Ligand binder design. Structure first.
Ligand SMILES: [Mg+2]
Ligand SMILES: [Zn+2]
Ligand SMILES: [Zn+2]
Ligand SMILES: [Zn+2]
Lengths: 900, 1098
RNA sequence: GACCAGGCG
DNA sequence: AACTACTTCC
DNA sequence: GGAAGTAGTTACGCCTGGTC
């Protein structure tokens, strides 16, 4: 067997079309009355057969097995190919009318040939040189080789060549160039002149651009379906070919009979229009060929180009077999690299497994079970290639005749590798390989930590599941695409697979100050997390009743590597003095006395020493979508299996903590005392008074413009600054008064979910609403709503919502908030469309670039793009947050390893 | 004063008197009463090529809904039979013909010109003015509001189109050439003309005409329209000295080149290129009379008024150039008029009637020529009757309604009515769409405008491409129906307005515009406006009239057109609203109606133009002497699905939008008629419930009679991480007791089609000798007649209507109807009937019981969507110290990021309502305050915060934190996981590309697009890409001639492989490539391109 | 089979 | 439509 | 250099129904 090494593109010669054809088509009909194809028609059986029961006259194959064969239509008068129209015009105006030479000087000929031989690798230089030669020839009036006037050639839209000659003394006339004389002009062009025109002497010929024989695409390339009504629905190509044959027959009849030249020219133009619309219906400046219904026909050009065309719709991307799709549901109790597959999908989709020495018994059992029982099989393929569906009265015999070397398409079972994909597919983590785990109900299951790579949020999301079928594909998936890898994002060199909301909040509830757990809770959480353990550590405290209690830090430390040691400040740092004291203690010797650290322990300073958590609370900094310090260190220093084990264990542990400890959000989470409410009220009152003063100053001309903008823009910017500062101050008051024991605050300060802005808008004023960065202005003249005096520029009248969500919005504020939400929702779709187009452009530009074995990055033709990838040779996925190596981390780690 | 609770009574009376679909019914009733006759009056009598014969048109009459039987006669037809027998609910249309023989008119003849489809509940339908029992006896839901059509058995609703106001000129800046552009959309007989004037950066004035290929200097058009004198032109355009100078400068260079008589010829050169001077003149005057300002007229007498209107437009563009006026906003609702069912039907009927008129002309001429004058004049009645051919008009109209493609570029005008539930149907009947393309980023058109207040719902709009471009009407919105303009013009002229012919406009004189065209001039325009509104309030002037003025530019606008969205307001005079307590009591006692209040001048209807002059108060205690109007009910500014949301002002706007959009997808008893209705798909919640916290608008509308959803006991806590990421945890015991249970209905249809030549198909159990015979097990439930017995369990791929068709293979083929491969159920109903043509038709309805499972989507009214992540037994659910077990658990992490305080307030209100035994009012702005609810919850014996002490079901100890628990109204959406799961090992393929088919309904394969290709490439997986894109879609083998590179031919008959192009037999080898690439090679070998292939040894 | 409309993430 | 980029008449 | 014309694109799936 061979593989395609290269494809040379050329223009088919008339003799090539005549020889390649299996029939010459003469009759403009498709089928007879009885339903059989008309001999000599567009559906002649010598071009292949598509209707079942028919037989091909060229191959002898049935429908769906005959590939299809070409036919030709000997045109009575040659026509102009629309695709090569501009090329023909350029060649015509760059070559002589009588001899056909390029009308260039011999010295210019040799110099331009030498420059053509050079700079051929890149298309742009060759194109520019061709344009220069075209300009030089076009300007010239007399052919240097033979003395002859060269009348200028005008070109309208397609296939209209119109050169202008001086009919009389001082009077010029435009003479239309019929395809016959144009083609003859093109044949007179010599072969030594073609390269300077850009044409290939062998694979192309300018005369072949004027086509006198039209190839007819095979029947299999334009199938016709019989409707349930009993009528026949033909393809657009079939209709266009029928019209072309009819008009060609009319032209041939008028030519052999003899007709006035005007009628012949009209029929010739009709045939040319038919051919042009056949090749490209949406060609510039041509009436599209419309269907009988009224829609335009889809022709060859429409068959190729477009998002629904051949290239994008059936070559780059195409529908595949052995795929499944259903809604996804959460499942924290499966590993990060596993997926829950419904029994229906597992029974439907199959994995072809060739029976060998070791899996003979299992395949025999699953053949015995058959397509009904889940651990069964659907098909059995003998070594000869004959396939047999498993059914009753077959299971026993096929199980007996399994032997060795046969193929058995078995059901999905636990451990099988599949591709899981939620397909807005932006980065390479949108498809990862998961291990199959068969589940009862009919929905896909996904671990929560793997949501961030897929951007899935269990609100109706659906994901596609593809089953690789060849052993090479299965190995490729299981080695390169498994979910254990890709924990670190290639984008920023940080953890993308980590805890999201409940893991972070439960970790904080676990490791925070004063959080203790009873013996039963500790044993249950350790068993739930999957941590292997045969003895509990010594308890930290003792209850008033003498019951032993464990600290959350000890429980968390039970699942850390015994060598890990790191310190950092997380988001819970509100008093930097305590963090500075801890850092000062650490810097003196790098191995502080554990009790001394426990004396100065703080929630805002995480300090792990030999795998024991001595200070700090679990935050988004421990593990998260970005900046997971502990997870990054575990995945970079201990491997990728250890990272997966730690991730699974910590997710289950935190889930147990948050479930059995209680985590809720109520109305009281947005409550503020009377003092905080009064402070916020005074904040808004002062802001409104300041805005009023600014407005009054601007009305009296008292205010003067800021640099770079006018008076109106100065006033607008000052007002927005004042309003934003007022919102910030009210949010600061709310932050001061709400406290850290509020669950809504807890999940916001720890990064689990929500920002400070949400709490500010929910417990204090909503703040100023804006569209496109400006204050609300769209509405009536001088106002937004008809409930405000025209010409009002005040805070409330322009979108400043003074109410919280808890306090409820007034109707005006409700409309203003609706405007803000509308602008956001409108922004989303435009942004996603623009980003998608830009990503497509970037991918199509940078697809093939790769790192060679010498370390360089090279273009497909061998051009060196980078002599060392990233200018240092480090992959961003393997880098330390963009750094080549974390020097300080390595130094501290080694010093603690040896001196410890 | 009057409490808002007292204005609620008036608003409820408004909704009681006029339904929710009054726009469709009003427009269609106006169309039937006057529109059809108006169109027929535009279409003058047919004049054929007969020496002394032509027919005039009499009076259009529409009869009762009747259907002509194929072998019987016109029986009466009712909508249920029209939508069951796959008929079109239409009525005969009759037109009188007046034959004019040699200038004299004979007796009229009434001939049926076609059938006109009838909108339900309109003044011609058979359901009009029928009591509830009468509608029930006809197999109809009395709650159904009508307003839609039945076309070929399917319910079609015409969605209003938000077009730009016709005949109104708008000024704006191009910002590219510093050219001020002023365009007008002139309408006449369904044809729009885009006449625009232009002041370019050179200071010269240009005019654009749609059929003139190039712009023309303005003064040339002005002189072509009959303005001979230069000074007359300068005076007509404007009298302000600066404008006078601009016109003098613009006119000197025009008069120095083109005079009055030369302008028509100059336009003719561009319009009709060539040497035919008379033809150029004819084309120029044609495009002047028809294609420039058609709304003014098409007669040469209307040329001068075209000149005045063009001068006014030029004056406006000059004023924009001088900056004396602001840019005209295109999203301002003073500039947009809706197109309703009446006007769209008028245009469609105009097109169809033109087709019929031309056809009848052709038929008359042909018949007269091909039988002379023997009986054409001997009996003219038969000559007219036989030439009618009425099917053309009805086929055109029915096709347009069924496909939705209106004449012209309009598409999607008629849409399939949504019958998922009550809310979806009513919201579809109250929907507005924009004609702009959804792909482009129309930032200014997709945003909320201040003029939408009370006219368009601020929150209900779809997500994605249609956001902002698809709008739903506010509950207080009222859409006008046009009054005769001539009477309005006469009244305005009688008021003191002097036409511009006698008195020319001046800076100190008010310019009055009626319906967007300038009519005359008056002094003290404020007095004219005051007189107009006083007359309207006094009742002598119709409600539809609206008037506004502008002190900035001294212009008075009078509107009396159709398609204006308006809102009602209470007139406030001297700080005292017109509405009083005794009016409210009279309305409450039924002595006074809404139309009465409108007629007495108590309540006023204002569109955007008149509202611009208003200073509206929002609350009765906010009224001062400076206020002109008071808001009837600020909570009515929302749409209907948006009004379903309780406490909408405590939620973020995106979540309100999500809730409003998801309210239209819930399951419930949408219509009581569902049992006997034939519909492709439907759902039925087994136990719908009233929302405990509900708005009063929902009861006034009628949502309480057709509820969709249930009240759940919801606890907000994190439980085993199975409600993480917007997932929902639900109770198994609650499901087993009927919570969120539903049934899915599907109606399969099988027709006994009658082919040509008498070759019919037969309803029968086919013998195994027929071609395409399925398994004998699939016909298990069939009866000897050929139809499946009702109440028989049917699973996937089992047939319901055994059917065989005449052979067409190249024995009878099989075309029986079976259930869809992934659908099961029980056969609820089998009906047999007769089609329109007379063939037998059978509808089979299968019902499938859908008990909630993992993956089914649930939503609340506050936009909190989610799927069931786990189904937990009751003994595993936590319980409260009061014995309350949740029916549903939601993660607290979804609350703060979404900022839905309204959901928490609704939970508190639901608990309080359950404890009190009285439902809690959750209206938008007058509902029960959260403080009152918390105090009441405190007094009832529960914690005021709503948190309760809960115990863990698994371990038995109480949770450390107090858990927030309440009652929230959750609704089950129709996005069930059983309707979405799909898996394809291997199946059918497309004939053209040999690739797997597309769609869940036809064993389709999932598209592995190019984005996934790049994802696979970025992983380095090269063999996996091969396996996914080559082996599993279209792998094939081809024979390639190594000598030429073309595709070799294999002769299966002769057992030889060779290349016909070169005749090689030894240099032939197989290659492996996707069938799509071979097809690409075929399409490249077409259009004459040679893709020579080079082969390599591997 | 391609056209339209409506949704889903 | 609304952007870009050529092309191409001026 | 204009100053117009002309052409070329404008995310990815998936589902439903209805008409040709
Ligand atoms: Mg989602
Ligand atoms: Zn063949
Ligand atoms: Zn020469
Ligand atoms: Zn060959």
């Amino acid at each position: 067997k061979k593989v395609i090494g290269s494809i040379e593109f050329g223009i088919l010669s008339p003799q090539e079309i005549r020889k390649m054809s299996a029939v010459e088509v003469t009759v403009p009909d498709t089928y007879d009355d009885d339903g059989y194809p008309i001999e000599g028609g567009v559906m002649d059986k010598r071009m292949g057969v598509i209707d079942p029961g028919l037989r091909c006259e060229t191959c002898g194959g049935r429908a769906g097995e005959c590939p299809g064969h070409f036919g030709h239509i000997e045109l009575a008068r040659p026509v102009i190919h629309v695709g090569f129209a501009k090329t023909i015009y350029r060649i015509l105006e760059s070559t002589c009318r009588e001899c056909g030479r390029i009308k260039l000087t011999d010295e210019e000929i040799e110099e331009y040939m030498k420059k053509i031989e050079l700079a051929r690798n890149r298309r742009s230089e060759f194109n520019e040189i061709i344009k220069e030669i075209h300009k030089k020839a076009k300007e010239r009036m007399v052919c240097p080789h033979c003395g002859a006037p060269q009348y200028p050639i005008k070109f309208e839209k397609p296939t209209i060549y119109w050169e202008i000659r001086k009919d009389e003394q001082g009077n010029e006339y435009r003479h239309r160039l019929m395809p016959t004389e144009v083609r003859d002009w093109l044949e007179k062009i010599p072969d030594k002149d073609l390269p300077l025109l850009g044409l290939d002497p062998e694979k192309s010929r300018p005369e072949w651009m004027v086509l006198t024989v039209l190839p007819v695409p095979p029947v299999t390339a334009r199938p016709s379906i019989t409707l349930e009504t009993g009528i026949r629905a033909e393809d657009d190509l079939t209709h266009k070919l029928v019209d072309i044959i009819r008009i060609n027959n009319r032209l041939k009849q008028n030519i052999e009979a003899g007709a006035p030249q005007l009628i012949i020219e009209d029929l010739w133009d009709l045939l040319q229009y038919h051919v042009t619309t056949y090749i490209n219906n949406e060609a510039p400046g041509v009436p599209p060929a419309k269907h009988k219904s009224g829609r335009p026909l889809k022709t060859l050009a429409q068959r190729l180009k477009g998002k629904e065309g051949r290239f994008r719709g059936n070559l780059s991307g195409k529908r595949v077999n052995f795929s499944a799709r259903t809604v996804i549901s959460p499942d924290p109790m499966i590993s990060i690299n596993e997926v829950g597959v419904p029994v229906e999908v597992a029974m439907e989709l199959t994995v072809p497994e060739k029976v060998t020495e070791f899996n003979i018994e299992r395949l025999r059992k699953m053949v015995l079970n058959g397509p009904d029982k889940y651990p069964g099989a659907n098909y059995v393929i003998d070594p000869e290639g004959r396939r047999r569906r498993i059914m009753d009265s077959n299971k026993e015999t096929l199980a007996n005749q399994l032997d060795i070397g046969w193929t058995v398409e078995r059901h999905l079972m636990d451990g099988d590798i599949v591709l899981f994909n939620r397909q807005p597919s932006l980065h390479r983590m949108s498809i990862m390989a998961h291990r199959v785990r068969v589940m009862p109900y009919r929905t896909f299951r996904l671990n929560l930590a793997v949501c961030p790579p897929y951007n899935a949020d269990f609100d109706g999301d659906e994901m596609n599941l593809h089953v690789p079928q060849t052993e090479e594909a299965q190995a490729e998936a299981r080695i390169l695409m498994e979910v254990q890898n890709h924990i670190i994002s290639p984008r920023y060199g940080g953890p993308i697979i980590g805890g999201i909301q409940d893991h972070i909040s439960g970790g904080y509830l676990l490791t925070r100050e004063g959080a203790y757990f009873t013996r039963d809770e500790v044993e249950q959480m350790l068993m739930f997390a999957g941590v292997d353990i045969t003895e509990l550590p010594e308890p930290d405290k003792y209850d008033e009743n003498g019951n032993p209690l464990w600290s959350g830090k000890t429980i968390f430390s039970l699942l850390l590597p015994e060598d890990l040691t790191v310190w950092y400040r997380n988001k819970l740092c509100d008093e930097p003095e305590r963090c500075e004291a801890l850092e000062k203690l650490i810097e003196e010797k790098l191995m502080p006395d554990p009790e001394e650290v426990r004396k100065l322990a703080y929630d805002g300073f995480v300090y792990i020493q030999n795998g024991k958590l001595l200070s700090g609370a679990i935050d988004k900094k421990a593990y998260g979508r970005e900046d997971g310090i502990i997870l990054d260190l575990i995945v970079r220093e201990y491997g990728v299996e250890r990272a997966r084990q730690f991730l699974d264990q910590v997710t289950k542990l935190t889930i147990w903590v948050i479930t059995h400890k209680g985590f809720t959000t109520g109305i009281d989470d947005e409550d503020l005392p009377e003092e905080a409410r009064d402070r916020i009220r005074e904040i808004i009152r002062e802001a409104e008074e300041r805005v009023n003063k600014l407005i009054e100053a601007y009305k009296r001309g008292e205010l003067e413009p800021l640099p770079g903008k006018s008076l109106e823009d100065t006033l607008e910017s000052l007002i927005m600054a004042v309003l934003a500062e007022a919102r910030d101050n009210a949010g600061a008051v709310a932050e001061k008064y709400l406290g850290m024991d509020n669950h809504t605050v807890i999940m916001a300060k720890t990064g689990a979910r929500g920002k400070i802005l949400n709490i500010t808008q929910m417990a204090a004023l909503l703040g100023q609403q804006s569209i496109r960065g400006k204050r609300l202005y769209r509405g009536f003249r001088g106002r937004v709503l008809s409930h405000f005096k025209p010409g009002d520029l005040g805070a409330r009248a322009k979108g400043f919502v003074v109410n919280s969500y808890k306090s409820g919005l007034t109707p005006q504020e409700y409309f203003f908030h609706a405007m803000g939400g509308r602008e956001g929702l409108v922004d989303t779709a435009v942004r996603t469309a623009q980003s998608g187009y830009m990503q497509r452009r970037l991918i199509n530009a940078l697809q093939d670039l790769k790192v060679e074995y010498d370390g360089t990055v090279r273009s497909p033709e061998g051009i060196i793009v980078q002599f060392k990838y990233g200018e240092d040779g480090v992959d961003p996925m393997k880098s330390w947050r963009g750094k080549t190596v974390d020097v300080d981390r390595i130094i501290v780690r080694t010093l603690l390893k040896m001196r410890g | 004063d009057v409490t808002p609770d007292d204005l609620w009574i008036v608003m409820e009376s408004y909704w009681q008197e006029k339904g929710l679909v009054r726009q469709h019914l009003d427009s269609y009733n106006a169309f039937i009463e006057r529109g059809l006759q108006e169109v027929v009056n535009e279409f003058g009598g047919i004049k054929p090529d007969i020496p002394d014969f032509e027919v005039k048109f009499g009076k259009i009459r529409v009869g009762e809904p009747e259907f002509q039987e194929p072998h019987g006669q016109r029986k009466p037809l009712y909508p249920m039979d029209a939508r069951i027998r796959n008929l079109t609910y239409a009525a005969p249309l009759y037109l009188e013909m007046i034959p004019v023989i040699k200038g004299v008119e004979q007796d009229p003849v009434e001939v049926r010109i076609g059938e006109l489809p009838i909108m339900l509940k309109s003044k011609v339908c058979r359901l009009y003015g029928l009591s509830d029992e009468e509608l029930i006896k006809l197999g109809e839901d009395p709650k159904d509001p009508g307003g839609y059509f039945i076309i070929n058995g399917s319910e079609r609703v015409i969605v209003s189109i938000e077009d730009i106001a016709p005949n109104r000129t708008l000024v704006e800046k191009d910002e590219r050439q510093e050219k001020y552009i002023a365009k007008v959309f002139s309408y006449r007989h369904g044809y729009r003309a885009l006449v625009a004037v232009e002041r370019r950066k050179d200071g010269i004035l240009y005019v654009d005409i749609p059929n003139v290929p190039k712009p023309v200097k303005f003064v040339y058009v002005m002189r072509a329209l009959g303005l001979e004198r230069d000074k007359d032109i300068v005076e007509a355009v404007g009298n302000d000295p600066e404008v006078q100078q601009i016109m003098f400068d613009n006119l000197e260079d025009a008069s120095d080149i083109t005079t009055q008589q030369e302008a028509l010829e100059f336009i003719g050169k561009l319009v009709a290129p060539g040497q035919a001077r008379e033809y150029r003149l004819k084309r120029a005057e044609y495009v002047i009379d028809n294609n420039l300002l058609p709304h003014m007229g098409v007669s040469p007498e209307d040329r001068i008024k075209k000149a005045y209107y063009l001068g006014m437009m030029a004056l406006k563009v000059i004023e924009l150039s001088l900056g004396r006026r602001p840019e005209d906003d295109k999203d301002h609702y003073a500039n947009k008029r809706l197109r309703l069912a009446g006007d769209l039907l008028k245009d469609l009927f105009r097109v169809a009637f033109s087709q019929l008129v031309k056809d009848i002309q052709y038929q008359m001429t042909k018949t007269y020529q091909r039988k002379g004058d023997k009986y054409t004049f001997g009996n003219i009645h038969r000559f007219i009757r036989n030439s009618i051919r009425p099917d053309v008009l009805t086929e055109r109209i029915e096709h347009a309604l069924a496909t939705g493609a209106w004449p012209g570029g309009r598409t999607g005008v008629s849409q399939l009515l949504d019958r998922t539930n009550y809310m979806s149907t009513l919201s579809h009947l109250r929907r507005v769409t924009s004609p702009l393309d959804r792909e482009q980023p129309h930032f200014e058109a997709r945003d909320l405008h201040g003029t939408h207040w009370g006219r368009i719902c601020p929150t209900e709009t779809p997500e994605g491409p249609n956001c902002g471009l698809v709008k739903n009407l506010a509950l207080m919105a009222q859409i006008t129906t046009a009054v005769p303009e001539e009477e309005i013009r006469e009244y305005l002229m009688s008021l003191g307005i002097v036409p511009i012919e006698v008195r020319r406009p001046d800076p100190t004189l008010w310019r009055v515009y009626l319906n967007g065209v300038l009519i005359g001039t008056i002094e003290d325009g404020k007095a004219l406006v005051q007189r107009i509104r006083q007359d309207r309030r006094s009742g002598k002037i119709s409600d539809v009239i609206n008037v506004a003025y502008y002190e900035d530019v001294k212009e008075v606008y009078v509107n009396s057109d159709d398609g204006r969205v308006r809102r009602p307001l209470i007139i406030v005079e001297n700080g005292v609203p017109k509405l009083t307590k005794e009016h409210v009591q009279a309305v409450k006692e039924g002595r006074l109606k809404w139309s009465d209040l409108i007629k007495m001048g108590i309540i006023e209807y204002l569109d955007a133009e008149e509202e611009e002059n208003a200073y509206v108060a929002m609350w009765p205690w906010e009224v001062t002497e400076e206020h002109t109007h008071l808001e009837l009910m600020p909570a009515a500014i929302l749409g209907l699905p948006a009004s379903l949301v309780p406490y909408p002002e405590h939620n973020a706007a995106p979540r309100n939008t999500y809730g409003a959009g998801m309210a239209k997808q819930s399951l419930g008893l949408g219509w009581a008629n569902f049992r006997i209705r034939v519909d492709t798909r439907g759902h039925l919640l087994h136990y719908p419930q009233i929302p405990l916290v509900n708005s009063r608008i929902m009861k006034a509308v009628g949502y309480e009679d057709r509820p969709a959803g249930q009240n759940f006991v919801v606890a907000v806590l994190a439980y085993q991480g199975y409600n993480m990421e917007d997932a929902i945890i639900i109770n198994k015991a609650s499901i087993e007791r009927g919570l969120a249970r539903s049934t899915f209905f599907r109606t399969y249809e099988a027709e006994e089609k009658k082919y040509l030549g008498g070759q019919t198909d037969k309803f029968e159990i086919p013998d195994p000798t027929v071609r395409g015979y399925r398994g004998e097990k699939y016909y298990r439930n069939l009866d000897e007649d050929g139809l499946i017995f009702p109440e028989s369990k049917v699973e996937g791929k089992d047939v319901l209507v055994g059917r065989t068709s005449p052979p067409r293979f190249l024995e009878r083929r099989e075309t029986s109807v079976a259930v869809r491969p992934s659908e099961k159920g029980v056969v609820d109903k089998v009906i047999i009937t007769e089609t329109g043509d007379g063939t037998k038709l059978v509808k089979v309805t299968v019902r499938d019981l859908r008990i909630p499972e993992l993956g089914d989507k649930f939503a609340s009214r506050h936009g909190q969507k989610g799927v069931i992540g786990l189904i937990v037994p009751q003994e595993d659910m936590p319980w409260t110290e009061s014995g309350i077990v949740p029916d549903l658990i939601v993660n607290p992490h979804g609350i703060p990021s979404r900022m839905t305080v309204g959901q928490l307030i609704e939970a508190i209100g639901g608990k309080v309502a359950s404890l009190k035994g009285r439902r809690v009012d959750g209206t938008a702005f007058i509902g029960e305050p959260e403080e009152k609810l918390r105090k009441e919850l405190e007094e009832l014996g529960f914690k005021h915060t709503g948190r309760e002490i809960m115990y863990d079901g698994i371990t038995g100890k109480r949770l450390e934190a107090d858990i927030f628990i309440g009652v929230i109204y959750y609704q089950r959406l129709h996005h069930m996981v059983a309707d979405k799961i799909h898996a394809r090992s291997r199946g059918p393929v497309q004939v053209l590309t040999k690739q797997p088919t597309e769609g869940r309904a036809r064993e389709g394969g999932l598209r592995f697009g190019e984005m996934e290709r790049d994802v696979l490439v970025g992983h380095g997986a090269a063999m996996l890409l091969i396996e996914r894109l080559l082996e599993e879609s279209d792998k094939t083998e081809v024979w390639v001639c190594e000598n030429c590179g073309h595709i070799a031919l294999e002769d299966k008959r002769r057992r030889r492989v060779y290349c016909p192009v070169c005749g090689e037999e030894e240099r032939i080898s197989k290659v492996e490539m996707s069938y799509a690439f071979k097809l690409l090679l075929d399409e490249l070998k077409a259009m004459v391109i040679r893709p020579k292939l080079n082969l390599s040894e591997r």
